[PDB]
Every structure is written in structure tokens, then in C-alpha cells.
Design an enzyme around this catalytic site. Structure first.
Site, short mmCIF file in Angstrom:
data_model
loop_
_atom_site.label_atom_id
_atom_site.label_comp_id
_atom_site.label_asym_id
_atom_site.label_seq_id
_atom_site.Cartn_x
_atom_site.Cartn_y
_atom_site.Cartn_z
N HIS A 252 48.48 37.33 53.15
CA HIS A 252 48.48 38.80 52.87
C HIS A 252 47.19 39.50 53.34
O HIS A 252 47.05 40.69 53.07
CB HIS A 252 48.88 39.12 51.43
N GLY B 262 39.01 40.67 45.47
CA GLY B 262 38.17 39.87 46.34
C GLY B 262 38.25 38.38 46.09
O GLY B 262 37.72 37.61 46.90
N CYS C 191 40.97 36.46 46.08
CA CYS C 191 42.02 35.76 46.81
C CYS C 191 41.44 34.73 47.76
O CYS C 191 40.36 34.92 48.32
CB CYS C 191 42.91 36.75 47.57
C1 LIG Z 1 43.59 39.41 46.52
O1 LIG Z 1 44.36 39.88 47.63
C2 LIG Z 1 42.13 39.67 46.81
N1 LIG Z 1 41.79 40.48 47.92
O2 LIG Z 1 41.29 39.18 46.08
C3 LIG Z 1 44.10 40.07 45.24
C4 LIG Z 1 43.59 39.41 43.94
C5 LIG Z 1 44.01 40.21 42.70
C6 LIG Z 1 43.29 41.55 42.58
C7 LIG Z 1 43.06 41.74 41.08
N2 LIG Z 1 43.19 40.41 40.52
C8 LIG Z 1 43.70 39.54 41.39
O3 LIG Z 1 43.92 38.36 41.17
N3 LIG Z 1 45.55 39.99 45.28
C9 LIG Z 1 46.30 41.08 45.49
O4 LIG Z 1 45.82 42.19 45.64
C10 LIG Z 1 47.79 40.90 45.51
C11 LIG Z 1 48.32 41.14 46.92
C12 LIG Z 1 49.16 42.41 46.88
C13 LIG Z 1 49.09 42.95 45.45
N4 LIG Z 1 48.35 41.95 44.68
C14 LIG Z 1 48.17 41.90 43.36
O5 LIG Z 1 47.65 40.95 42.80
C15 LIG Z 1 48.67 43.07 42.58
N5 LIG Z 1 49.61 42.58 41.60
C16 LIG Z 1 50.89 42.93 41.71
O6 LIG Z 1 51.23 43.76 42.55
N6 LIG Z 1 51.75 42.33 40.87
C17 LIG Z 1 53.20 42.47 40.89
C18 LIG Z 1 53.62 43.92 40.69
C19 LIG Z 1 53.77 41.95 42.21
C20 LIG Z 1 53.73 41.64 39.72
C21 LIG Z 1 47.55 43.94 41.97
C22 LIG Z 1 48.16 45.20 41.38
C23 LIG Z 1 46.60 44.35 43.09
C24 LIG Z 1 46.78 43.23 40.86
C25 LIG Z 1 49.84 41.04 47.07
C26 LIG Z 1 50.46 40.93 48.47
C27 LIG Z 1 50.75 40.61 45.91
#
Ligand SMILES: *[C@](O)(C(N)=O)[C@H](C[C@@H]1CCNC1=O)NC(=O)[C@@H]1[C@@H]2[C@H](CN1C(=O)[C@@H](NC(=O)NC(C)(C)C)C(C)(C)C)C2(C)C
Ligand SMILES: *[C@](O)(C(N)=O)[C@H](C[C@@H]1CCNC1=O)NC(=O)[C@@H]1[C@@H]2[C@H](CN1C(=O)[C@@H](NC(=O)NC(C)(C)C)C(C)(C)C)C2(C)C
Lengths: 300, 300
Positions: B41, B137, B139
Site C-alpha cells: 500500500h 508511519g 507500517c
Molecule cells: C501505515 O500505512 C503506515 N504508513 O504506517 C498505516 C498504519 C496505521 C496508521 C494508524 N495506525 C496504524 O496502524 N496503515 C494505514 O494507514 C492503513 C492503509 C490504508 C488505511 N489504513 C489504516 O490503517 C486505516 N484503517 C482503516 O481504514 N481501517 C478499516 C476501515 C479498513 C477497518 C486508518 C484509518 C488510517 C487507521 C490501508 C491501505 C488499509
């Protein structure tokens, strides 16, 4: 989000652990530049000055993995032995020796035979013990904090008290608390709960969406401390309140209001509920631990 | 003695963390030999196959400290991206990729911008979430176990669920649980308590001098499991009982007798008392975790 009892990454310290063997005793040492630090009880009501005048450099076998280190001098500083070796540790990080205050937390890298076994987070208790996880052979394991790139060593393990808690020294060999490295009657002393840490952890809970323990009430520092004593909590000082300022600012909850919430938790218990997955009031997170874990500070 | 929620020493994994930046997204990658693994992603109901066919190698900026890594190829394996780089990681440990079973524990090295922030111990929950500590951050941070000298990577972080728990993949990019890396409605699923782990931890408590919860009673596997369901505990299998054999042997407490003790704890609660400093029944220690911490196994 989430909140975990989190240790510092241990790589900088793993690179410093060595095995020190003298006579029948084997334990761990900390190799920094050309000096290995270990507990002075590795030497053969003992009088360590006498015992040490009677030992030779070749009596100390220092093993760094599969490379034997030759000792070229030795000295004793309080309860630690400093073995001068002919090779500087190339993995020596930036480092400081610090003597911490009770209530301060640190990571422990538990070691046996110079080999890291595990890493976990501890607090120095108000009675200057730590509730560690230490088996025979773990002496010389160290506790530490990391500030950006610098390892601040604050603890080296020496002994276990009959209550199952642990006592040790700073890296200059001064014991925390009244303990001595003698097999003589010693008791830990009545412990107390680290109040400023409990409050920090309650702020961590709010930052993470737990709010059920909040109330509309407030208290004065004086009336809070009156309740704190009855429940064996450390006095909360104005300095503690000041330290809690940032967390108060981020959450919008005045420190004195969070005190009123802690008061009500002390008086009514948690009544079937958890806070951050604990059914107890947790006191081994400092205010700075909470800010580090809830804002994302890294080290390098 | 003592019992702590202990992580593996993180040095072998710290040496593998890098920063991966693509477009406006920055996250962490795992650099092993000449491949960097990161969540798919990071690329600009998305169709990642389309998105990836449209990216070039020079769109991926991989930073290992202050040394930029040039990507010479890329491929997608399930939900992870594999960036081929022109330099093999000289710090690459012995390693395996493993897909763990729910109930298994691992250490998480939380990272931001390729820089380790902290290390903590997790379990894969029965509902295939983990209760981690992850900010934006994080991930690409990985979970792992270490067996003597070998790092077994089992988790890479991808996302957070609305309940504050976390979901991710194995290092081959297959999600644990029914989750997908889409911003679509997803719920974690009802969790349950890891019964065999609770029993292991009760044995840890006995090994460490806690005995107050023991009783003279026994139970059959069938009658225990009848009680387990009412309290939302995982079924205990004969295989679980077999796994608990060594701990039973060391303590002299038949597995079925420790089950009778857990039954009484479930039915009467802990009534003001703690076990290993917890007021809850702890389920994130496996039987092997208990044996490792109570016998002193090291890694290298
Ligand atoms: C990761 O991409 C990073 N850059 O660190 C991040 C880690 C997240 C951010 C807050 N806590 C974490 O563990 N992961 C994401 O942003 C993923 C990414 C996009 C959305 N996302 C999420 O974790 C979101 N959750 C979410 O959408 N949950 C659903 C509705 C699917 C049950 C969110 C809102 C940013 C926390 C993808 C592709 C899932
Ligand atoms: C350490 O020397 C090593 N080799 O690892 C060891 C670590 C101990 C062992 C079990 N858990 C630990 O943390 N430390 C010691 O053996 C020290 C050492 C000798 C006795 N000792 C103890 O810890 C003992 N405790 C003890 O005697 N406590 C008193 C009575 C003083 C309150 C014991 C019984 C071995 C646990 C010295 C010089 C204190």
C-alpha cells in the site's frame, strides 16, 4: 494507537555483552572501549579489597563470542570490577553512565554467559529494588535508556532479595538502596506506588480512547496527597504536576482533574473494568514514556 | 526469579530496517540480502496490480540510514512489495519466514522512518488481530521470534482496525485473518482468551512462588472445556495438554489439576489478589515462553 510496555531496541547493548569467568563463577560483563564492567562478586562477609589484591589478570577469562579477551589491568570502583582489556570494543555505542532516581524506568537486557536472552521494561521502585526477571547467571546484565543515539546505562544486576525482587548498582558500582553485595540479612523495605507514573498512564489511556474513569471533579494537591498516603502512593509534588503538563495540554485534562479521577479509582477500585488492558493501576510508565510511545519518537 | 513480558533482543532485526518512500507515502521496509520487503500500500477499492504496472523502479526511494538504496526491480507477492536493490544487506541475519498460528507470541520492533522506536511482545489473537502499539508511519514494522541464531519473521504491520487493534501479513504478504488492505468496512471478529497460554502462565506463577490459586481438585478435559466456553476461552485440546507436559513435570501439578484451578479462578474471580503482578488472567505467554524465561535460554 495502542499502548504497550515497550523496551528500547537492544542492539546497541547486545554489541557490548561479554562473558566474564573467574574461578568457578561465570557472569556477564559490559564491554565499552577497552574496559569490561562486571559485578565485583565474580572474584574468588567477604573483604573484596583483600580478595582482589590476591587475583592476577590471567585469572579473569573474558569471552566475547568466540574471541577471548586478554585482561591487561583491573581495578575496583565501589561494587563493580573494571577489567582493562587489550582490545577496544568496535561496537561501542555513544554512551553515558547515569544514576537514576526512583520512579524512573529503563530497559533490561537479560543475559546469560554473555548472550542476550530477552529485553523488558522495568522501573526503579521507590524502595530501590526492581521487579526483574533474573535467573542464576544473569549478574552483569544491564539496564539502560537510549536518547536519540546515546545509550545511558543506569543499572547492572547483582543479587536477588528473598521477596523475589532484585537489587543492583549503577555502572559506577554504587548500589541503589541500602543493599550490599554480602550474603547477610537484608530486606527490601516497604514499597510504594509511583503516583506521577500512574497519572501519566491514565493520560496514556485517554490519548488511546479510554475515558470511563474520568469524572467532573477536581482536587487540590493537598487533598489528593492526603488520599495518596492512605493507599501507599508516593507524594505528588508540584514538580510532578509540572512534568505532567504536556500530557495535560495534549488531552485537555488539568493535572489536578486527573488527580481527582485517580482519587476515585483508589477509593472505588476499578469495579470489573480495565484500563489499557490492565485491571490494576499501572505505575511503570513515566510521563516521558507516555509521550515517546504516543508521539512516535525513534532512536539511532 | 521473577516473570516479565519479555521480548527477544532486537539487534538482528534493527540491522534490517529501512525507509521506503513512494510518492507521498513513507513507511518501513525489511532489507534482507538484496530485497526490501514492505507493504504493497506504499504504491500510488484500489487495484494494486494496475497501480504497480504504472510505477517505475526510480519511484521507490529506499533509505538505509544515510545511504540511499537503488531499486533495480520490483514485484508484488500477495500484499507485500519486494524491491530488488543493488546491494545485499551485510547485516542480514540467518532468517526464515514463518506463518504463525493464533495463540503464538512474537516480538514487535516498532519503527518509524526506518528507525527502531521500541520492542514489545505480542500474541496473535484467536481473531487474527494483534493488540499492538502502532502510530502512523509504523507500517512495515515486523514481528519475529529468534531461535538460537535464526530470526523467524512472522508479521509485518499494515493497518489498524476501528477497535484500536492491528492487522497485518506474514512476510509473504498473506494477511492474518479475513482482512484486506482496502479502506472498506472490516471488523475484527469476536476475540477469545488463549486457554493454553493462561495455563502456561499459571505454571509460571507456581515456578515463581505464587500458589494461592491452586486447589485440591481436578477436572476432565470435557468438563473444563464446558466451563471454558461460557467464559469465552478457546477450547483446550489434548495437544495443548501434551504441550503443557514439561511445565506439569517441573512443577508436579497435573495439567488437568491446573485446569481445575483455572476453572475456580474463572468462576470466583481473583478476589482482590494478583498473580505475577496481574489482576487479570494473562494469555500472551506460550508454554515455550514460560520455559524460556524460567530456564534461561539465550540466543546468538
Ligand atoms: C501505515 O500505512 C503506515 N504508513 O504506517 C498505516 C498504519 C496505521 C496508521 C494508524 N495506525 C496504524 O496502524 N496503515 C494505514 O494507514 C492503513 C492503509 C490504508 C488505511 N489504513 C489504516 O490503517 C486505516 N484503517 C482503516 O481504514 N481501517 C478499516 C476501515 C479498513 C477497518 C486508518 C484509518 C488510517 C487507521 C490501508 C491501505 C488499509
Ligand atoms: C549473580 O551473581 C549471577 N551469577 O547471576 C546472582 C544473580 C541471582 C541468582 C538468582 N537470581 C539472581 O538475581 N547473584 C548472586 O548470586 C548474589 C551474590 C551472592 C548471593 N546472591 C544472591 O542474589 C543471593 N541472594 C541473597 O543472598 N540475598 C540476601 C540474603 C543477601 C538478601 C541468592 C540466594 C543467590 C539469590 C551476592 C554476593 C549477594
Amino acid at each position: 494507537s495502542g499502548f504497550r510496555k515497550m523496551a528500547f531496541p537492544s542492539g546497541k547493548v547486545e554489541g557490548c555483552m561479554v562473558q566474564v569467568t573467574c574461578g568457578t563463577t561465570t557472569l556477564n560483563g559490559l564491554w565499552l572501549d577497552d574496559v569490561v564492567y562486571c559485578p565485583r562478586h565474580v572474584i574468588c562477609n567477604p573483604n573484596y579489597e583483600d580478595l582482589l589484591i590476591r587475583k592476577s589478570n590471567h585469572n579473569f577469562l573474558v569471552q566475547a563470542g568466540n574471541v577471548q579477551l586478554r585482561v591487561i589491568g583491573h581495578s575496583m570502583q565501589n561494587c563493580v570490577l573494571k577489567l582493562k582489556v587489550d582490545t577496544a570494543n568496535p561496537k561501542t555505542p555513544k554512551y553515558k553512565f547515569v544514576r537514576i532516581q526512583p520512579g524512573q524506568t529503563f530497559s533490561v537486557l537479560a543475559c546469560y554467559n554473555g548472550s542476550p536472552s530477552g529485553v523488558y521494561q522495568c522501573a526503579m521502585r521507590p524502595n530501590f529494588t526492581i521487579k526483574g526477571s533474573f535467573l542464576n547467571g544473569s549478574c552483569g546484565s544491564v539496564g539502560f535508556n537510549i536518547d536519540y543515539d546515546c545509550v545511558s546505562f543506569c543499572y547492572m544486576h547483582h543479587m536477588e532479595l528473598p521477596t523475589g525482587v532484585h537489587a543492583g548498582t549503577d555502572l559506577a558500582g554504587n548500589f541503589y538502596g541500602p543493599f550490599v553485595d554480602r550474603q547477610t540479612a537484608q530486606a527490601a523495605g516497604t514499597d510504594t506506588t509511583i503516583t506521577v507514573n500512574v497519572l501519566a498512564w491514565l493520560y496514556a489511556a485517554v490519548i488511546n480512547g479510554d475515558r470511563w474513569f474520568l469524572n467532573r471533579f477536581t482536587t487540590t494537591l493537598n487533598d489528593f496527597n492526603l488520599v495518596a498516603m492512605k493507599y501507599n502512593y508516593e507524594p505528588l509534588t508540584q514538580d510532578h504536576v509540572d512534568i505532567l503538563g504536556p500530557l495535560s495540554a495534549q488531552t485537555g485534562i488539568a493535572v489536578l482533574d486527573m488527580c481527582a479521577s485517580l482519587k476515585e479509582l483508589l477509593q472505588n477500585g476499578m469495579n470489573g473494568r480495565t484500563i489499557l488492558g490492565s485491571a490494576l493501576l499501572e505505575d511503570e510508565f513515566t510521563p516521558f514514556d507516555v509521550v515517546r510511545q504516543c508521539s512516535g519518537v525513534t532512536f539511532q
